[PDB]
Design an enzyme around this catalytic site. Structure first.
Site, PDB file in Angstrom:
ATOM      1  N   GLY A  97       2.597   3.700  -1.547  1.00 17.21           N
ATOM      2  CA  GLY A  97       2.956   4.049  -2.911  1.00 17.21           C
ATOM      3  C   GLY A  97       1.811   3.755  -3.879  1.00 17.21           C
ATOM      4  N   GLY A  99      -0.994   2.168  -6.287  1.00 17.79           N
ATOM      5  CA  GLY A  99      -1.878   1.035  -6.076  1.00 17.79           C
ATOM      6  C   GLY A  99      -2.018   0.546  -4.647  1.00 17.79           C
ATOM      7  CG  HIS A 134      -2.562   8.227   4.415  1.00 15.97           C
ATOM      8  ND1 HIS A 134      -2.655   8.502   3.070  1.00 15.97           N
ATOM      9  CD2 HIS A 134      -2.412   9.421   5.034  1.00 15.97           C
ATOM     10  CE1 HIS A 134      -2.561   9.806   2.883  1.00 15.97           C
ATOM     11  NE2 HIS A 134      -2.413  10.386   4.059  1.00 15.97           N
ATOM     12  CG  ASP A 135      -4.164   3.820   0.484  1.00 13.37           C
ATOM     13  OD1 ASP A 135      -3.241   4.640   0.715  1.00 13.37           O
ATOM     14  OD2 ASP A 135      -4.126   2.968  -0.436  1.00 13.37           O
ATOM     15  CG  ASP A 172      -2.238  14.300   5.216  1.00 17.30           C
ATOM     16  OD1 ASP A 172      -2.671  13.204   4.789  1.00 17.30           O
ATOM     17  OD2 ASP A 172      -2.263  15.356   4.545  1.00 17.30           O
ATOM     18  CE1 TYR A 199      -2.801  -3.339   1.359  1.00 23.03           C
ATOM     19  CE2 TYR A 199      -4.326  -1.699   0.471  1.00 23.03           C
ATOM     20  CZ  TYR A 199      -4.058  -3.001   0.872  1.00 23.03           C
ATOM     21  OH  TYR A 199      -5.043  -3.963   0.821  1.00 23.03           O
ATOM     22  CE1 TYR A 218      -2.175  19.628   6.689  1.00 22.88           C
ATOM     23  CE2 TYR A 218      -3.533  18.238   5.267  1.00 22.88           C
ATOM     24  CZ  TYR A 218      -2.335  18.480   5.914  1.00 22.88           C
ATOM     25  OH  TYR A 218      -1.304  17.570   5.773  1.00 22.88           O
ATOM     26  CE1 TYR A 220      -5.219  11.695   3.229  1.00 26.02           C
ATOM     27  CE2 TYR A 220      -4.853  11.860   0.857  1.00 26.02           C
ATOM     28  CZ  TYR A 220      -4.553  12.255   2.154  1.00 26.02           C
ATOM     29  OH  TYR A 220      -3.583  13.205   2.381  1.00 26.02           O
TER      30      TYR A 220
END
Lengths: 124, 124, 124, 124
Positions: free
Chosen positions: C30, C32, C48-49, C99, C28, C73, C52
């Site tokens: 990077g 794809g 994190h993915d 983040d 994950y 932000y 989002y």
């Protein structure tokens, strides 16, 4: 409650006995808590610790048996999967999640026997 | 010597800067030493500290410029693999073997960014 | 936005270039996704993915530049400490926390060179 | 033989049940082979798989009951340390070493519960 938390650990970690395995690991994984977590598995217990404090301060937790240690919630363990069921009792739901997260975190974390039964000094 | 050790690390873990990555990590990597390594990387630099002591006590290491830091040995870095060429001078060979083992221990070990510039204490 | 996320990573992990270290790690970190995270650092990326994906659904996230990739932000990096400042714009505040959380564990997580530039198959 | 290998693991990592812990882990531990080891533990089980193959071809091993699973060698477990006693029969001694190395590697290796019964997928 803690009895239910043990059960959740038994769900995500079937053959192991919590009272043996996670009862004296790292700095936070059991007895008190001080210093910096020796690893991820220790962080799960640390997170579990302060997730209990938040629960003890949640304006939504009633009386006497509203604590994370004695407050029974509603949950399910099906095929090694944990699901919290409480709906309207926002406090029980919160406590059920502290345990669900911890039990899952414990399963996915590296158990490093070098970080088990540590020496106090490593926790100053 | 220190310049070559740097090269070895640079050979084994190219995606790192040896100085910034390995001289202020844990409690034995770079500076001092003292009280149980916080992890694998840390013990690597503990082993490499003991190894530098032995070398100084090796009968075969005598005279100016025989010390691990300043002693220039013979080595090769091909396709990411380290080889010590010293046969005759068994002192240089021993020094090269410390660096090689260390540079290999480094690459093969989990690096935790947070273990950089730790407290004091954890090393009591 | 991504430019700021990169900065946050430069805050908790100084002197290391995010575009080289975290752009092709695990399954994950990077381009794809797909598969199950090889380790903790990989999960920090998986989390994190999805964090989002959540923000792209947050009813509090508005127009063209409300997305986590382009939504600027407000935050502060003081002594390696990340803090989100937004209040009224709960969306920005959400994106800033994705983040901050990721940048924070990227530093606590172990970086295993063996889980970097993995093999596709290793992600099904 | 396999009974002794079980005991060896019992020697170096007593807090665990060998069968349940090291026989259905990763892509190599216990069941079948193939793919890239999910982690260090999986990887000890790969080298203790190769070693067994070596022993079988080892000219120095011949006849019924010379195989690694059934060949009974001579070893000792004292205060958590293992030592292979075979001298004369270098077939038994080799089989004992494979076991010693693995059981001894099982211990100094991070155990990830979640790696048990992984998805025959990341073994491609």
């Amino acid at each position: 409650n803690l009895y239910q938390f043990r059960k959740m650990i038994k769900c995500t970690i079937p053959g192991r006995e919590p009272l043996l395995a996670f009862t004296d690991y790292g700095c936070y994984c059991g007895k008190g808590g001080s210093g910096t977590p020796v690893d991820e598995l220790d962080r799960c217990c640390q997170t579990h610790d302060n997730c209990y404090d938040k629960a003890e301060k949640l304006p939504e937790c009633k009386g006497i048996l509203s604590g994370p240690y004695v407050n029974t919630y509603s949950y399910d363990c099906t095929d090694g999967k944990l699901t919290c069921n409480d709906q309207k009792d926002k406090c029980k739901l919160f406590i059920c999640n502290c345990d669900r997260t911890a039990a899952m975190c414990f399963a996915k974390a590296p158990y490093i026997e070098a970080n088990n039964h540590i020496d106090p000094n490593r926790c100053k």
